[PDB]
Amino acid sequence: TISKEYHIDEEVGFALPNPQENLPDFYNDWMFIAKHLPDLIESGQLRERVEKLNMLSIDHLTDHKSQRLARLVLGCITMAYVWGKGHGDVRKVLPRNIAVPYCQLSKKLELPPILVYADCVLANWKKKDPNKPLTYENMDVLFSFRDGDCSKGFFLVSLLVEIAAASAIKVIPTVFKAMQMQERDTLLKALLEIASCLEKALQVFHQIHDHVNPKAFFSVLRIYLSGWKGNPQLSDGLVYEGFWEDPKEFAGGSAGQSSVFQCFDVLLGIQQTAGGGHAAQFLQDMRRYMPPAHRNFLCSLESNPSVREFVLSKGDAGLREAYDACVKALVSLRSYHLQIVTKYILIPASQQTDLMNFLKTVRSTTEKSLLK
Amino acid sequence: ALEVLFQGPHMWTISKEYHIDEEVGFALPNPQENLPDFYNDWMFIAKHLPDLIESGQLRERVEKLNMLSIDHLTDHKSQRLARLVLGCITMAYVWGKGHGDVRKVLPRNIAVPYCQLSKKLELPPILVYADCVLANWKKKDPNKPLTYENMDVLFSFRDGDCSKGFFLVSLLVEIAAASAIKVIPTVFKAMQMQERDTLLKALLEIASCLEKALQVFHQIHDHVNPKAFFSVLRIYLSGWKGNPQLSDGLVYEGFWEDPKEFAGGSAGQSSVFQCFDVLLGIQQTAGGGHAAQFLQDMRRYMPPAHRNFLCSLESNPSVREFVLSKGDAGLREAYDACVKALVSLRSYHLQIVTKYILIPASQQGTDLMNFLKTVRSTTEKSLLKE
Ligand code: HEM
Ligand code: HEM
Ligand SMILES: O[C@@H](c1cn(-c2ccccc2)nn1)c1c(Cl)ccc2cncn12
Ligand SMILES: O[C@@H](c1cn(-c2ccccc2)nn1)c1c(Cl)ccc2cncn12
Known part of the structure; x- marks a missing residue:
């Protein structure tokens, strides 16, 4: 099985298992702002509460879970401070009392000082009842931006798809061992089990329609997910007062930062990061927005022999069909996700x-990777 | 690679799967000089680029070629030679005499086998550092050592372009720096096993290799002249990414419908310099700045096994964090000797760029x-003590 150094959980995969909900009492001033973003934003009180903060030291965040929660807290606060009510009045400077500890904590976790997918999705969750399973009914997000922004449905359904796709990650070492030991039947069973997991993850995706509405997603949630890289509203980036002299550009939170989808593209030899095109550049760049242990896992998968080249060289129809079932399952996920983006972004725009x-x-x- | 999945990123040995040679490092050991007779028409053009370009006959010889199948290139060495052959031909075809008359479409009979062979080797269809430096060489006498006098490049662009001196001196520096790569597993094993004296000796041995590599760099002045380098060689080293002369990229006829953009050959694609920056925790690829973006992007222009080696070094524990945390002057000084050796190489290289580019320009700019x-x-700001 996969090394503990990669920080992949047997149950939730790349998600942070049982994330911390409360920070030490020393950070109550950060937690108050983060827990009341909808109210402080609407009332125009948020920017003042951030400007009134004292610079808190990062030293009291003793473990990884408290450092991850603080990153989620500070990142949500930063999005609300920069974007305000989301109607054009932007802030081009982040106050030193929040920017300094945000950048220091970000340097510690090897993540950029902007809200990433590992913050708003992987660490932004809790079980309502710890004795009930990981289902939408038994879950909630830790932080929201506005009342009615559908951030619970958006972040939770992404998390549920991450978790569903994670059951196929445990099969990865079975695939590479079967190739090395030349265990054809083992490899075929492993490939069919990965396809089975990805097919099941498509059913999980259907939940998006019951918990997210297009108007609230597009007109409200979209605003706070925006970053400052190639953004006309912040063309030079954000100034991180007290940490850097010049404004720095960082891309906003993206599911392109999800390690579970990138790891199946790497596993199946779908060269998403090849060819010098714009999509390849984006997905490669998004690896530096992933937790370092997860970025390392992707590198390690790339360093292993090609499953695609192995299957292509065997002249075995059953093995080719098991490989194609995996690729077809990813094509179906992306095709369904395209229909969702048409409903939630294209039409409301x-x-x-x-x-x-x-x-x-x-x-x-993905489609061009089918052996046929 | 299978044990790294289960046990974790622990590079206590340099695996043969990384394709790092004990003698020449990231360079291709003893590259192939001749292709099978089936490709004689490619080899004639590649071997006579200076003459065909100067006479205005090159574009016609390329356009008269038949589409040759890549199936007859059976091993990695013949595939690497063919990539160097086709890449040199592509630069000459696109740029011509280098005076504004560019070609925006690469003929299908050369673009199709170039892109197919490029896809096979996981490299972009443009001349890269691993082609013009790492695989563009031969020993004149196989029984004599790796010295400039006993070496030659396989391909040139123009008569008097100094491409032999430029490519060979880069190769000799690559080879000199390669003797420090074998010390990398000694460094990670010493850190894991907490062998302080072993680590110190290992860091001083890496510094010794990098210091020696600076002396190798001095040879540049005897084999390259600034006028020929700037006015002639510079032209053929250019790519088509953000290039006003080919603003949309090159059309690879029969392979892709749209013109594709690829950056030109760069020593920023050298794996040996990037691997010491990663080893010493000099975060060249961090911050989101232009230099960081460039060096990160240049990893996709490296051979896949070498690109894998770099990310495996990043996955390993930090040598810098280890040395910073020990409160040991001897260890800090051995680490600083490594960083200072890289600063000296880059400072000397800045003087070279002033001589060969800045002043002729x-x-x-x-x-x-x-x-x-x-x-x-x-690099300089990574020194623990000034
Ligand atoms: C309200 C529904 C959704 C909308 C409007 C939406 C929107 C988008 C957009 C705009 C992108 C392009 C990249 C970017 O701008 O950051 C994207 C990428 C992506 N999304 Fe979503 N998405 C939705 C639901 C989901 C869910 C539930 C998942 C599951 C984890 C997901 C997974 C992905 C992945 C993996 C990518 C990266 C590209 C790919 O690998 O195909 N999305 N999404
Ligand atoms: C005629 C002499 C030389 C000139 C004019 C020259 C020019 C350049 C230029 C213009 C760059 C910037 C990147 C690019 O434009 O692609 C560069 C980068 C670089 N060059 Fe050279 N170079 C010379 C000799 C060498 C030699 C002999 C080596 C040895 C291998 C070398 C190693 C490097 C490295 C490693 C970089 C990447 C940046 C860095 O890590 O510092 N150069 N060179
Ligand atoms: O990529 C982001 C993202 C940005 N936007 C967006 C919307 C409208 C206009 C511009 C951007 N939509 N989604 C993202 C996040 Cl942060 C979290 C989960 C997820 C699932 N699929 C995408 N996910
Ligand atoms: O980076 C390239 C390079 C690009 N240019 C240049 C100069 C002027 C205008 C445009 C490009 N000069 N050298 C390079 C190659 Cl391809 C090979 C060895 C080497 C050593 N140092 C740099 N090396």
Whole structure:
């Protein structure tokens, strides 16, 4: 089985298992702002509460779980401070009392000082009842931006798909051992089990329609998910007062930072990061926005022999069909996700396309990997 | 690679799967000089680029070629030679005499086998450092050592372009730096086993190798002249990514519908310099700045096994964090000797770029100087003591 140094959980995969909900009492001033973002933003009191904070030291965040929660807390606060009510009045400077500990904690965890997928999805969750299973009914997010932003449905359904896809990660060492030991039947069973997991993850995706509405997602949630890299509203980036002199550019939170989808593209030899195109550049860049242990895991998968080249060289129809079932399952996930992006982004944008092209390129690359 | 999945990133040995040679490091050991007779038409053009370009006959010879199948290139060495052959031909076809008459479409009979062979080797269809430096060499006498006098390049662009001196001296520096790569597993084993004296000896041995590599660099002046380098060689080293002359990239006829953008050959694609920056925790690829983005992007222009080696070094524990935490002057000084050796190499290289690029450019820009100054500055700021 996969090394503990990669920080992949047997149950939740790349998600942070049982994330911390409360920080030490020393950080109550950060927690108050983070827990009341909807109210402070709406009332125009948020920027003042952030500006009134004292610079708190990161030294009292003793373990990884408390450091991850503080990163989620500070990152949510930073998005609300920069974007405000989300109507054009942006802030181009982040106050030193929040920027200094945010950048120091970010340097410690090897993550950029901006809200990432590992913060808002992987560490932004809790079980309502610890004795009940990981189902939507028994779960909640830790932080939201606005009342009615559908951040619970959006972040939780992504997390549930991450968790569903994680049951196929345990099969990865079985695949590489079967190839090395030349165990054809073992490899075929392993590939069919990965396909089975990815097919099941598509059913999990269907839940998006019951917990997210297009108007609230597009007009409200979208604003706080935005970053400051190539953003016309913050063309030079954000100033991290007291940490860097010049404004720094960082891309906003993205599911392109999910390690579970990138690890199946690497496993199946779908060269998403090859060819010098825009989609390849984006997905490669998003690896530096992943937790270092997860970024290391992706490297290690790439360093292993190609499953695609192995299957292509055997002249075995059963093995080729098991490989194609894995690729077809990823194509179906991405095709369904394209229909979702049309419903939640494309159509609401018309009632008020570069993202669609990115998703269509990634999907096309997956489709072109079928051996047929 | 299978044990790294179960036990974790622990590079206590340099696996043969990384394709690092004990003698030449990241360079391709004893590269192939001749292709099978089936490819004689490719070899004739590649071997006579200076003459065909000068006479205006090159584009016609390329356009008259038949589409040759890549199936007859059976091993890695023949595939690497063919990539160097086709890449040199592509630079000459696109740039011509180097005076503004560019070609925006690469003929299918050369673009199809170039892109197929590139896809096979996981390298972009443009001449890279692993082609023009690492695989562009031969020993004149196999029984004599790896010295400039006993070596030659396989391909050149123009008569008097100094490509032999430029490519061979880079190769000799790569080879000199390679003797420090064998010490990398000694460093990670010493840290794991907490063998302080072993670690100190290992760090001083790496510094010794990098210091010796600076002396190898001095040979550049005897084999390259600034006028020929700047006015002639520079042209053929250019790519088509952010290039005003080919703003949309090159069309690889019969392979892709749209023009694709690929950056030109760069020593930023050298794995030996990037591996010591990673080893010493000089975070060249961090911060989101232009230098960081460039060096990260250049990893996809490296051979896949070498790109894998770099990310495996990043996955391993930090030598810098280990040395910083020990309160040991001798260990800090051995680490600083390694960093100071890289600062000296980059400072000397800045003087070289002034001589060969800056001054000739002025006798008729500084964006490359700023890139080199940022990389040098990052190295200098990694010293634990000034
Ligand atoms: C309200 C529903 C959703 C919308 C509107 C949506 C939107 C988007 C957009 C705009 C992108 C492009 C990258 C970017 O801009 O950051 C993207 C990428 C992606 N999304 Fe979603 N998404 C939704 C639900 C989900 C769910 C539930 C998952 C499951 C984990 C998910 C997984 C991905 C992945 C893996 C990518 C990266 C590209 C790929 O590998 O295909 N998305 N999404
Ligand atoms: C005629 C002499 C030389 C000139 C004019 C020259 C020029 C350049 C230029 C313009 C760059 C910036 C990146 C790019 O534009 O692609 C560069 C980078 C670099 N060069 Fe050279 N170079 C010379 C000799 C050498 C030699 C002999 C080596 C040895 C292998 C070398 C190693 C490097 C490295 C490692 C980089 C990447 C940046 C760094 O890590 O500092 N150069 N060079
Ligand atoms: O990529 C982001 C993201 C950004 N946007 C967006 C919306 C409208 C206009 C521009 C960007 N939509 N999603 C993302 C996050 Cl942060 C979390 C989970 C997830 C699932 N699929 C995508 N996910
Ligand atoms: O980085 C390239 C390179 C690019 N340029 C250049 C100069 C002027 C205008 C445009 C490009 N010069 N050298 C390079 C190659 Cl391809 C091979 C060895 C080497 C050593 N140092 C740099 N090396």
